[PDB]
Design a protein around this nucleic acid. Structure first.
Ligand SMILES: [Mg+2]
Ligand SMILES: [Mg+2]
Ligand SMILES: [Zn+2]
Ligand SMILES: [Zn+2]
Lengths: 589, 589
DNA sequence: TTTTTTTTTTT
């Protein structure tokens, strides 16, 4: 019952952070600068500053937030009166609630309490409007009266029309007045439980969440998020009894976090090592022995090149990798690692996917009867990585649907009266087997690969993996048994901080091509084209795409070391890795 | 008539277990310590203690369960006052009801009586909430009053709204108040009668059951369960009568069991015998003469290896077996035995299965038009065994759908806007015929098997069965006729005991590899690779998967004797069985 | 009719 508004104000005005800069007065300082009407407060900080204040938020959230938010509004007005007439209400979002519940473990005892759920966002609806205070007109020739229907109370989830006119006490018909009605932004989304916590032999569960006001459009499908709010039962058709007094539950979101400064200097410290590139390569799939050239190639695809956008066209900046190898060469294990270390990645298989599922699907809503688009795997992976294992098992009639997405990075649909064009700027990493399961060295490369030259030309690097039992079997066997015994390689960058390093590099580093790098690349391309003319039977063609592959690889090498430009050393590395690619496919220079 | 609360409390505190250790007193504090709020009792023990109490439970169940619930709750409160304010109600569940009725024999006379049904779980719905006590507000400008609608009575299965406001006696509008409403967990499941119970020439029948409160998520689809509770008629759509006074029936589950200390002593006693391994093998398919190497291989697949989960990857722990043989070699009979003895197994046929049915199917829900996922055979067999008879009859373009699930143990779907990943950690045992029905010795091994090298490398062991008539025909004929004469082989572990032994071993034994075993395995693997490279024509490739097969087989041998370590003896057995596999496919060693 | 994934008969 003690007044916490004074406690809140002194907590906000007077607080010391780890950096010792009064973290919580700069947030409100920027609150009036951009007028974002939302403040983020950590539960750990409020608990340390005042244990009693933190508890009251947890258990009395229903009737402490409006008072707490109202106190903050007055303080903001005192700081700057100009905030008036621009923002009427300010929301306070609390994160870091210790009450974390698994999606499958929610029971009746958790209804009405502030909890946190970690999951995957799978579906988002367009932003709509919700009525919380309506205005009605009594259509009865004596009344012609206006009144806000829900008195001293907001409109509930179910819309209700007055039965007795409050202005005259008589029944009749009432007409809604949209211009005098108060609205609020409304959005609906679906959260799916992570695959880690799904029990054996069961399908993942889903929960419906509601985003309102400034929380709308705060995430995109496929994101991993943490949501905090209050559970409640869902009402859809209360008018129709139809027996079955059984209801589903939904969650009213109060705050959302999508999965800091101490990371910046940690990343900067790593980039200062002259051997940072070797450390990153050694950290790719530590459980796999050998395959150093493949690990280097996979590292390049994670960083990628620099896309170019011009007045009349744009140039692809992503790097595509294709691996062909004998069974048991750990191709799938490395692809699994890539899907985990990448900040955004989608893992698909050749057999378990279709053309519609990879790019876009036209689906007809049975209710309304109209068609609309559904995002495919490549569209969802925009700005990230797409992994397509067992690509050779795809039907050729179905695999050609990704030809334009691989180069033009767009998806074109002309179906059922829908003409659309969606961005699909995603890198593609694929693996497969030769025509006869294992590579036959007694036959040409033409019949071993069994892939059209059109798709082969789209891959920046192609590596043919041969399982040759030689003298390295003992070393390989010892390494595998050590892995099974729990022994782990040391002096490697762990997956968590490696993910942060890639995300930072892809966002703030844009290397530039220097004059000396241009000469090395130009000379190499001329020799590459000249050497290819010797053997025209090979299904590998040296097209101008290969020249742009060298440019992209050179930029990726510079991006690994966080350099701002491409020097001759990065160009030399790009030529070296390209040489190994050519040797594998049988082109020797 | 009389109150048995004193008897019930006395029975709980005075009953004697098998060792007269009061097998019921230590359950009470376990209930208190973990706040499980659910206690189970055995009907045989209650009948053995007091005959009168057992009859009252078996007959007056609906008017004695709340009475015993209140008495037990009071005994808990005095034992520990902290139990209050955390659990407001404790349920007591009775099992072992003598009233057992087949699913097909239920008649109107059994309605309203405590019965028990044994069947197979097929469908389970997500957990929902059911209102048992509502709160309404009369929306009439004079009332604004809140009240609990169902007075001194639980809310019926049909949601009924008050017609006359009790607080004012007038009709009008009533608004539900979710905050003051009381809810209870609610789940719906479907049970099917056992295949051995279905009459000739008819489809199996199904029954709908309801699980509430702590009984939710008590089992997974495909389980064998025994459900006890009260039958009742189902009221689903009472809005419009439409004549049809006919109703279905459903069951309110009171206690559910799936599929112990005395068994543990029996299991541990068996493991003391030095020849337990040979004794177990002799118990595999006792009606089949010969095929000793096959029975040993099948025994290993039942136990499996030790899966390894690391911070960056996971390693398969299951063992896959492939059998190719001439018709009439008892391949199907042995596979049928594995289904009966395995704690969890799924039996499929190559011709009677599809790619979508094996892994996962995307289906359009008719009510809403939205696509959703359906679990396939491999997903339903997670943590168990999947049997695929007549694998050679599958279309090759359709058989490749299980390549991912057999090594990575995952199912990936990218179809119709759905991207998902599912766990399929199951062991695969497959059988089939050679290319020409019977094995042809003139032709090589490559054209006889007629399978791609990719699928062959996935199998830990491959055995080729040749039906060669010889001097052993008389022994085989005598054995078969003895089986038809009713004579049974003795000194074999019964199937029920063997199933318990395997389930215990797979849950509590995790063997570890010693230094001595590592040296033996490494030497043998190197020897395979050298020998394989000498004859680069066989359809069997010695990939690194073969090395991991040796580790998995060695762990299975140790797990078969409940050993915590993999000594050198288990390594020799693993090497020996692998030698026979190589000789079968014509690879000499 | 229309696009989609599925099992099925029949174009
Ligand atoms: Mg693979
Ligand atoms: Mg058969
Ligand atoms: Zn009026
Ligand atoms: Zn009233």
């Amino acid at each position: 019952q003690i007044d916490y508004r004074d406690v809140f104000i002194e907590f906000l005005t007077t607080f010391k952070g780890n950096n010792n800069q009064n973290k919580y007065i700069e947030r409100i300082n920027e609150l009036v600068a951009y007028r974002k009407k939302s403040l983020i407060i950590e539960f750990s900080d409020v608990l340390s500053f005042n244990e009693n204040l933190a508890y009251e938020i947890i258990n009395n959230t229903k009737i402490i937030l409006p008072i707490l938010e109202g106190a903050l509004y007055d303080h903001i007005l005192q700081l700057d009166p100009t905030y008036q007439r621009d923002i009427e209400k300010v929301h306070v979002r609390i994160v870091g609630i210790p009450r974390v519940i698994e999606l499958r473990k929610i029971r009746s005892t958790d209804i009405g309490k502030l909890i946190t759920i970690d999951g995957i966002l799978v579906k988002v609806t367009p932003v709509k409007e919700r009525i919380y205070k309506a205005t009605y007109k009594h259509i009865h020739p004596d009344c012609m009266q206006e009144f806000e229907w829900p008195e001293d109370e907001e409109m509930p989830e179910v819309l209700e029309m007055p039965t007795i006119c409050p202005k005259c006490g008589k029944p009749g018909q009432f007409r809604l007045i949209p211009e005098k009605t108060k609205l609020i932004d409304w959005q609906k989304a679906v959260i799916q439980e992570r695959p880690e916590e799904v029990p054996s032999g069961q399908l993942p569960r889903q929960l419906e969440i509601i985003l309102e006001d400034d929380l709308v459009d705060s995430a995109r499908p496929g994101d991993r998020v943490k949501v905090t709010g209050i559970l409640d039962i869902k009402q859809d058709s209360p008018v129709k009894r139809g027996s079955r007094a059984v209801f589903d539950i939904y969650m009213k979101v109060s705050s959302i976090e999508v999965s800091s400064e101490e990371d910046e200097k940690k990343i900067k410290d790593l980039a200062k090592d002259p051997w940072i590139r070797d450390r990153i390569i050694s950290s790719i799939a530590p459980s796999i022995y050998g395959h150093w050239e493949l690990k280097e190639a996979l590292a390049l695809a994670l960083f990628g090149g620099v896309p170019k956008v011009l007045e009349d066209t744009r140039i692809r900046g992503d790097i595509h990798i294709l691996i062909i190898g004998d069974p048991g060469t750990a191709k799938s294990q490395m692809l699994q690692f890539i899907s985990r270390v990448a900040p955004r990645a989608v893992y698909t298989t050749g057999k378990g996917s279709t053309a519609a599922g990879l790019t876009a699907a036209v689906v007809r809503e049975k209710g309304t009867g109209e068609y609309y688009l559904e995002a495919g795997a490549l569209v969802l992976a925009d700005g990230g990585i797409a992994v397509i294992d067992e690509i050779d098992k795809m039907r050729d009639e179905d695999r050609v649907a990704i030809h334009e997405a691989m180069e033009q990075q767009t998806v074109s649909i002309a179906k059922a009266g829908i003409v659309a064009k969606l961005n699909a700027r995603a890198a593609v990493i694929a693996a497969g087997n030769p025509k006869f399961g294992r590579y036959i060295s007694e036959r040409p490369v033409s019949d071993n690969i069994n892939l059209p030259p059109t798709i082969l030309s789209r891959f920046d690097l192609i590596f043919i993996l041969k399982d040759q039992p030689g003298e390295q079997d003992r070393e390989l066997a010892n390494y595998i048994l050590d892995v099974h015994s729990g022994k782990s390689t040391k002096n490697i960058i762990d997956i968590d901080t490696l993910r942060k390093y890639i995300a930072y590099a892809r966002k703030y580093v844009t290397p530039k091509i220097t004059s000396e790098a241009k000469n090395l690349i130009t000379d190499f391309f001329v020799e590459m084209r000249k050497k290819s003319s010797e053997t025209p039977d090979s299904p590998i063609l040296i097209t101008p795409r290969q020249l742009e592959a060298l440019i992209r690889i050179s930029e990726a090498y510079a991006k690994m070391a966080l350099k701002a430009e491409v020097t001759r050393e990065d160009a030399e590395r790009a030529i070296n890795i390209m040489r190994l690619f050519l040797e594998s496919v049988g082109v020797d220079m």
